[PDB]
Amino acid sequence: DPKIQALLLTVLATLVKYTTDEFDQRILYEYLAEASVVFPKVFPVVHNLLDSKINTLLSLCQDPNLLNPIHGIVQSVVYHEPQYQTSYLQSFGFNGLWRFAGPFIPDYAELIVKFLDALIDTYLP
């Protein structure tokens, strides 16, 4: 299912976007290199997320182990350059996924107030 591929990819990309540990990044980007080659038609979804950090790691980095996956992803992307833009997550309701899982009220809280009040009113007599 392309939605499941897109969600999986977006989670891995989300984990790359934020995590500061280069050892985390090694593991994650190795999985993105395979995942790009595995799901090439869906991979464009993640490109916006990856773009900022991939520019950063290309221009800055000097670990070959982390770079080998990154260069693999760029190669894979160009080799298969779409059927699913970043907007695709929005259609099923996941545009916030990379939004929310970033670093640490009013609009959310009012909806939660209505939800909790409805939860009480349904469940509690």
Binding site: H47, N48, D51, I54, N55, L58, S59, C61, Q62, P64, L67, N68, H71, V74, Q75, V77, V78, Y79, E81
Partner: protein, 756 residues
Amino acid sequence: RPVEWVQAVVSRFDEQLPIKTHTKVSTEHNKECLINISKYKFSLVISGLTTILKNVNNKNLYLSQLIILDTLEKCLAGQPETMLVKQLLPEICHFLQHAAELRNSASGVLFSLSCNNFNAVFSRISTRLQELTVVDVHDIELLQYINVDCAKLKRLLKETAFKFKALKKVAQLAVINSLEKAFWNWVENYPDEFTKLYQTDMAECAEKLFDLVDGFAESTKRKAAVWPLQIILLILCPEIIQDISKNNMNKKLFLDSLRKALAGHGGSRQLTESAAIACVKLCKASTYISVIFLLVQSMVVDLKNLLFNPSKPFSVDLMIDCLVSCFRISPNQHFKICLASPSTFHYVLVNSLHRIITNLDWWPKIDAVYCHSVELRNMFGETLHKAVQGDLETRSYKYLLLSMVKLIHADPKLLLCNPGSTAELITGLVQLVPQSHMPEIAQEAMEALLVLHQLDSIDLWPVETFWEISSQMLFYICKKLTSSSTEILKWLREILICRNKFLLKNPICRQAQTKLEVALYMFLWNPDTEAVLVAMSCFRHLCEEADIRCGVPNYNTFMEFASVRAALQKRVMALLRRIEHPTAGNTEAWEDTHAKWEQATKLILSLQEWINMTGFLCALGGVCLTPVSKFMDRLLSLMVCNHEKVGLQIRTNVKDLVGLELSPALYPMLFNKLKNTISKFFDSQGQVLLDTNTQFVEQTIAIMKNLLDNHTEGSSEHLGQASIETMMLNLVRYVRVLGNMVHAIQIKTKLCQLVE
């Protein structure tokens, strides 16, 4: 957003150029990624590289340009037009000792470009030809470099012939030379297409151009310039060759003039010299295939009597082309002349053999030459002997020897196949490896010895021979290493890999293994960080050897070295302390290092090497438990080193190395020697003999504090073996009689910190 990240890789690659170890690995890894990206988005990568090349064009500059051009060539060779033509091609034209590398690189770029682009490069050439009809020739030189096939060659000749008479005389000359190379470019790349030519429009172009170029040839110098092309154009006309072997009269008179010029009957040396070039090019051409063989048979004897005459030497690349062609035509009279003779002939032979190996299905393989291996070995031994016992004659033996070693690198099998013989060959190569005055030869001798140590080669030298010879090489190399050491050590790593491979398929051996062990330990203190890391890597292969042998004492600590400037030396010394078990090697390494260190100590009284040697002796010395007793006495004498320029550094480093790095197994000797020394600071009435003794005491306090601070595993066991009580009593008693000055107060303070 893919374009933006491709541009980010391009931009990374640009910023990592030398003109602006991890930066090396990063650069190559970026280059390889750009190549693999170019495999798909070719014009993005080529545009970026072109843009960078323009910026760079408008030692590190050359290296940057080489990196860009090597990248371009590999991208273009990986190709699946407008800016290739309008942007890249003019920059590659701009390039067309580092200038020759850049010209070679740019030519390889242009060749690759031209494969799929040819019509554009030809349009540039055709436009400059047109401009030349109505003098700047440089675009015409592009004909030399471009990829050419049969149809393209025909087009180049047709275009040239039409315009040639309207061109100016300098342009005509540039065209003539450039077409000569253009023909070879086709024949070399597309030998099948040249073969098919001997199995009318090409011949019409070639004849028309021949007659035009003949009409240009009004003088001795112009004749000499055109004859190498005229023979090519005649070789492009097989039916004309068949007729003139019996409109064609000027072609017959040209061949007759070449024959007369080879036979010495032409008075003009320039025409004889040119005729050699032409007839070698003919001989060469025949190897890529016929009536041409009759033409070769009419000239080859006079050509051999011109180029291979020991009584009247010709005036090397031309001679090599001749010999290689003669071998390919008939795989040996001139060969025996080259085996016997001028050293320049030995040179031409060896380089010809090297080219035969390194460059078609009917070409004779090198194996016909394996009759002459004994004579090649004799030539090697003689040349080696003459190079080592050595101005112009000496310099020539060096170039010859390099070529013979390159030949051995190209193929060992020759030398070994006709045949002690192998042992002599290997011994000669091994003797070159140490030679400081010949780094290029030594490097190639190592590569030669490496290929000689590959499995297929060793079989030809089996196991009883491998053991004796390879161990003899190891022993000799290690013995020299214990007397470019780093490169020799890297190579010794790859030799050990080969030995492990050979044994995995499976008294001098014990001596060799011991000397290797000595050498590796002695490298652990070397002032070069790279050497130390390589030596560590060598212990891995020593373990692998023992695993392979045993599968049919130090091993744990060797594997820990395998797992691994000041921080590295600290790590090394920590490992050296974990060597419990004595071996002939570690013992000898200590004794040798001690001997070297004593010599270095005297010379000092290079410093970082002495510090590292000191540290190594301190760390390893436990195994030796006398020489060690004398070394410790010498260290103790150095704690009070009064030397004005290096004394503070000596005292500091002895203190730090004894206090942090000494072997736990030596603590019982150190405390007895400190005790005995400090005890001499008292008279028979137990009164203190007060600068040297005070300085010894201060350094002793710091050394003992550092020892006692240290948590090296197993150190507790050894700290128990000798009493400190009499020493510490004598230290405090000494320090008590020091007055109440600032320095004496600091010493009292330090002794309290030690006591704690």
